[PDB]
């Protein structure tokens, strides 16, 4: 009753068959009941104490998973590469010799047995780096219309009108870069693009919008760092071959693909990235978009016409852009105290518009308390900076949040429901005084603009405070 097992290898004219068992390759004679003709290579067989083939099993579903490299000329052997580049030639099983075998497939293999038995598909790599962002649309973005129009031209139009582009022989833009001071809405534009792509794909009816951070694609091992990017680009090419647009978003491109000279592996990622981008230029549906705060720290090689042909700069909002952002945030659906409705006869829209105008005028006025920095020049006189010169959409959002928090405090304490204008009025000064000590609002781009305006290098900066 206790019986062993082995792996069949081949059949011979003398009705004897090769079997691999316990690391030993032997020749055995099958039992009269079992016919050697029906037996096939790679099939597990049952042995006994006398080493007699008494029954034939099936193909085992356990062992190592290896990558197929090529098929040998004889058609029965295949050259594959293991996990640690252990290249080996293995006989193919009977089911392997629709789906036809192709290079790069994952195959079950036993190195000890030396045979490959079955093919197992794995195409879940894109799901690891898939990122979904709902509840963002171009309607939410305020104060940015020129940049939104440009990004729509760089993404939506080539896919919408391919015939027009082919008529005028105009190559669709392949690379779009977004740069500017922090908090101006680069990630907001990126997520709006992602949501629009998801809506378009649902209309066609998602996974096509791949998003990756820089430090995500770094591995501690000596290898496998190139493999990740290779798999990403292969998956992008497969999605392009599906016909739907695919967008890969390298978020915060300052971390990786920076300048080569600066240093103290980052040396190899940028060249192979350039090679992959050049090799994927044939696919119109593959678009690479990256956002970066430090545009100077990036290698100038990639910032050339060709790969990254399109550049977009998002500047700090002015008065009208601030008004647009406030309109985007201060909606009529928030509770409003009856004091403000009394002056406007319950007209929420007009009252809110007047409140927005008032707060924008307050936060953009050259008042004494709005002085922020004292720029020092070597020869010219000193210059006074204002809070308006460092305005951003994030600051407006935080001001609105603080005003709402004050309104909640008021309705908790005095029980008067609604939002007062004084909430915004004093939240403005609170926010301005909170960021007075910190010179964090300054950015190298801001200093470059200031130095290029006045005409002298910045020598000293002083934080004015009373």
């Amino acid at each position: 009753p206790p019986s062993g097992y082995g792996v069949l290898l081949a059949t011979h004219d003398d009705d004897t068959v090769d079997v691999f068992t316990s690391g030993r390759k032997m020749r055995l004679t099958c039992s009269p009941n079992i016919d050697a003709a029906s037996l096939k290579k790679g099939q597990t067989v049952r042995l006994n104490e006398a080493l007699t083939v008494v029954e034939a099993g099936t193909f085992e579903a356990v062992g190592e998973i290896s990558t197929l490299r090529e098929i040998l000329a004889d058609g029965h052997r295949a050259l594959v590469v293991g996990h640690a580049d252990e290249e080996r030639v293995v006989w193919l099983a009977d089911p392997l010799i629709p789906r036809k075998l192709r290079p790069g497939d994952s195959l079950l293999v036993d190195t000890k047995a030396g045979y490959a038995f079955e093919r197992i598909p794995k195409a879940e790599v894109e799901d690891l780096v898939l990122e979904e962002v709902p509840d963002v649309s171009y309607a939410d973005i305020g104060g940015l219309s020129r940049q939104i129009e440009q990004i729509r031209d760089a993404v939506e139009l080539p896919f919408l009108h391919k015939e027009l582009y082919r008529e005028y022989s105009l190559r669709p833009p392949k690379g779009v870069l977004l740069y500017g001071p922090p908090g101006c809405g680069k990630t907001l534009i990126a997520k709006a693009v992602a949501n629009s792509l998801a809506k378009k794909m649902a209309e066609v009816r998602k996974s096509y919008f791949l998003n990756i951070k820089g430090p995500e694609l770094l591995n501690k091992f000596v290898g496998e760092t190139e493999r990740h990017i290779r798999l990403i680009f292969q998956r992008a090419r497969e999605k392009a071959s599906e016909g739907t647009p695919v967008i890969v978003f390298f978020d915060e491109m300052d971390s990786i693909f920076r300048t080569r000279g600066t240093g103290v592996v980052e040396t190899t990622v940028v060249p192979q990235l350039l090679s992959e981008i050049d090799g994927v230029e044939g696919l119109e549906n593959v678009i690479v978009i990256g956002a970066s705060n430090r545009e100077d720290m990036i290698d100038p090689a990639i910032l050339r016409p060709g790969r990254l042909d399109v550049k977009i700069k998002i500047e700090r909002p002015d008065a009208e852009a601030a008004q647009d952002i406030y309109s985007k945030y201060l909606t009529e659906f928030l509770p409003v105290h009856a004091d403000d409705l009394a002056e406007f006869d319950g007209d929420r829209s007009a009252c809110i518009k007047a409140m927005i105008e008032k707060v924008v005028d307050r936060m953009y006025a050259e008042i004494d308390d709005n002085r922020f920095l004292e720029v020092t020049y070597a020869n010219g006189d000193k210059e006074v900076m204002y809070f308006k010169d460092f305005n951003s959409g994030a600051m407006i959002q935080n001001v609105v949040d603080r005003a709402k928090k004050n309104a909640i405090k008021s309705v908790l304490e005095t029980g008067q429901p609604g939002l007062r204008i004084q909430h915004l009025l004093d939240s403005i000064v609170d926010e301005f005084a909170e960021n007075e000590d910190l010179p964090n609002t300054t950015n190298p781009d801001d200093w470059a603009r200031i130095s290029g305006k006045k005409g002298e290098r910045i020598v000293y900066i002083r934080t004015l405070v009373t």
Binding site: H83, A84, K220, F221, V222, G223, V264, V265
Partner: peptide, 17 residues
């Protein structure tokens, strides 16, 4: 151009047996 020291970061290696 002040001379500066360095601190390296090791990369893992794959070794069997």
């Amino acid at each position: 151009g002040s001379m500066a020291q360095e601190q390296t970061k090791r990369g893992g290696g794959g070794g069997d047996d």
